[PDB]
Amino acid sequence: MSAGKTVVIALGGNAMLQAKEKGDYDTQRKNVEIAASEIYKIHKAGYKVVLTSGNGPQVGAIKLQNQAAAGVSPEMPLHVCGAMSQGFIGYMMSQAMDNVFCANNEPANCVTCVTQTLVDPKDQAFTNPTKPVGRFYTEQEAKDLMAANPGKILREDAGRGWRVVVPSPRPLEIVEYGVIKTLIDNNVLVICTNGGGIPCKRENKVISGVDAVIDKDLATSLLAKTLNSDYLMILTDVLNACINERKLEEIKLSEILALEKDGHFAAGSMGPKVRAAIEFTQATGKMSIITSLSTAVDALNGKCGTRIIKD
Amino acid sequence: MSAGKTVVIALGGNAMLQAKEKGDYDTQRKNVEIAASEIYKIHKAGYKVVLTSGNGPQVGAIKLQNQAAAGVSPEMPLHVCGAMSQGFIGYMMSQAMDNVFCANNEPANCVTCVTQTLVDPKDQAFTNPTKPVGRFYTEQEAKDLMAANPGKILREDAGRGWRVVVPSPRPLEIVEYGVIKTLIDNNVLVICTNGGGIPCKRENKVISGVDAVIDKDLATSLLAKTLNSDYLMILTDVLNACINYKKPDERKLEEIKLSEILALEKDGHFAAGSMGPKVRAAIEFTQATGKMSIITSLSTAVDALNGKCGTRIIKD
């Protein structure tokens, strides 16, 4: 209710895609329903919740489809693809949270907000795309893709295969900030900023879309401190941050500020996750949490996960 | 504006598509920008605004893409395509509204909500798909593709040419209504119900999508009344709903009593007509609420609001 602290939670890939599942609808739906049941617990413990997600595989299938059907229907640019993934991802999430609400005989009170994020158009990211999207290929398939379509680039994504890559500039402003705040002030569980937000530039007072995909964690950090949130929570499948064996539990700003200059996090898909938690904790004095989707409430209660706090 | 009366406006194909126009992104955006200018004037008059739209050409496109790409990427069902189209269309609309707000040194206060609409799974519509979506085809390009595409049904979209046709079951409930009313109470300009809502059924307390495209005027009419909005406004490309097309008896519905338009409906004056569901929709709002419903063209909206034009349906 009106009394709850606010937690901003950035769902990950596996809220939706497990390790090399195929992206059909039902598969993703069952994963979302599993996530929703965990989220619900946080709602029931009485925190206000802002939920975000990645959109990596989902925006990549969509851009793939736009490419493959170009001779048959006009191809949409990458920001429009991002928009369409928000609809789809936002649909799945809003519906499963409505269902878990109703199953527990609570009146549904959840929405998905389409979301734009301003970025810098001449960011270096536009001349070296580095953000993996879509499903995994082999280097065998990857090489034919590039041979086949030489505008497109694949790269190795942490031993899972090869993936198409897109420009990923830093998020500067969530355009729908005011509205998101209005909703949370009003006790709505808000889903927003799916996939980091639709990448846009603002020139001459004109917001127009640009072709990128933003880091979900960097955007949610931005969102969380903009909202002056009580917690930033980034969910994975792994209960903590680890190395090489160091398992990070509660750690102070400084020590983890010290571990990241030494690239404990320049090997993992974990660095900017750490980078996003740090910035938020730095900026707000409030705790950021990186845990598994499965121990989320345990973490809030302080029973587990990597928790980062002020000094 | 906290003092404002609320107006629920359904935008038409022409919000996004004009004349035989191609559906590239830039063309459609251009059209949204034009719609947004007109809308801004209603917000600037000081009215609260909930904006809806169709999604027929855009969801059929998306569905086209999923079918063409099915061998290379998993093909998404129609309700999931509906969701994506809200994403696409709501993004265009919000951005456009944002821009016109900024251009007028007014801070952005606008958002699209993904919207689910409940229907009846047994609704006859499911046995008789009727809603044209996507591009137009020759008769012959069409047969070429129900031999090819068994089950996928096409139909003669009104002496313009052939089109895919899908179940259009009647809307029963806007799942996000409460949130939409909360936004409106807080004076946010809300875009929602784009394409009439993602069609869903609710069974045993579980909501799940069904493969359909709901009439967006029916869904909007339903939303307006659930909101007890002050007006419901359906914007098209014709300044008015009309009677006896091409007689010298061709009359122009201007201000008109509920009783009189109902009877006209009953006698089949709009029946073989694009205005059919639009009149049904305004009737249903006005009959439920006593409030004025308006059928106008995008380019004379405020004048309609100001009572200088358009078909304005008033209670008995």
Residue numbers in the entry:
A (entry chain B): 1 to 244, 250 to 316
B (entry chain A): 1 to 316
Reproduce passages from the article:
A citrate ion occupies each subunit of the glCK homodimer in both glCK-citrateS and glCK-citrateL complexes. The main difference between the two structures is in the conformational state of one of the auxiliary domains. In the glCK-citrateS structure, all four auxiliary domains in the asymmetric unit are placed in proximity to the bound citrate, a state referred to as the closed conformation. In both glCK-citrate and efCK-SO4 structures the auxiliary domains are in the closed conformations, and the closure partially protects the ligands from bulk solvent. As with the nitrogen atom of the AMP-PNP β,γ-imidophosphate, the C5-carboxylate of citric acid interacts with the backbone nitrogen of Gly13. The C6 carboxyl group also interacts with Lys131’s amino group, located on the auxiliary domain. Finally, the C1 carboxyl group is bridged to Arg163 on the auxiliary domain via a water molecule.
